[PDB]
């Protein structure tokens, strides 16, 4: 997270940390949507690691220092969107299934809890303030991820300002949403991918976007791009299979 503040996992209990066997390596963030399912970004799985190489940790404030109430899980399998475009990042969404001995995997605690999925017809006013989280880099030129979870607060940009012309001619589809700091500017950064962009909707933090991509981290007037989740509700459902 570029800008922002250091946070406690209890303020974002749906944040998952995904590791890949190297010896472990921090891969991306994730979002707990159900007891055994977590959402993430399709671009995180380009290297095509077998499920048994992935570990999902829940309830951890520090990236590599074990929390007292954390829950580690093996990955049963994962589903990357069939139409994910490796060049434009369109359809950047994946589903990961947790391994367990029953139909229940993660258990609720003060440090582990699900975000609410958005209503299919969710529409927020321009500039709504939302927040995000992740263990990613603090700056684009940084060679290290964060030692501790961080949070940032951004505002949803108008669709009119979420275009190729605005993103230096980088391709922007209807499956994407822009959000940024309207003013150390806050922004997502490398390593935060797959994490959540959530907004308060009727007293509950609701998932609005999956941290996808951006140009650098925190450049004035250049918003971050996120996978537009409302467009994937039917896909989430059809794909949540045992």
């Amino acid at each position: 997270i570029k800008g922002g503040l250091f946070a406690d996992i209890a303020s974002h209990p749906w944040q998952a940390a995904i590791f890949a066997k190297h010896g472990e390596r921090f891969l991306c963030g994730g979002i707990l949507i159900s007891s055994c399912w977590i959402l993430s970004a399709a671009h995180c799985f380009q290297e095509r690691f077998p499920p048994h190489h992935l570990t999902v940790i829940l309830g951890r404030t520090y990236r590599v220092v074990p929390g007292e109430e954390e829950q580690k899980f093996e990955v049963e399998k994962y589903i990357v969107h069939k139409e994910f475009d490796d060049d434009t990042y369109d359809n950047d969404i994946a589903l990961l299934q947790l391994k367990s001995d029953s139909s229940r995997c993660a258990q609720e605690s003060s440090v582990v809890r699900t975000v609410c999925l958005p209503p299919a017809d969710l529409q927020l006013p321009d500039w709504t303030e939302c927040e995000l989280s992740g263990y990613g880099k603090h700056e684009a030129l940084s060679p290290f991820y964060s030692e501790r979870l961080k949070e940032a607060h951004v505002r949803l940009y108008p669709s009119s300002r979420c275009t190729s012309q605005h993103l230096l001619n980088r391709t922007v589809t209807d499956n994407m949403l822009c959000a940024g700091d309207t003013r150390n500017l806050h922004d997502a950064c490398q390593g935060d991918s797959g994490g959540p962009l959530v907004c308060l909707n009727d007293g509950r933090m609701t998932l609005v976007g999956i941290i996808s991509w951006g140009l650098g981290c925190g450049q004035k007037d250049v918003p971050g791009v996120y996978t537009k989740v409302t467009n994937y509700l039917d896909w989430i459902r059809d794909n949540m299979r045992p």
Binding site: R113, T114, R204
Partner: peptide
């Protein structure tokens, strides 16, 4: 339930 956090 969902979306609740340590406030």
């Amino acid at each position: 339930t969902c979306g609740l956090r340590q406030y």
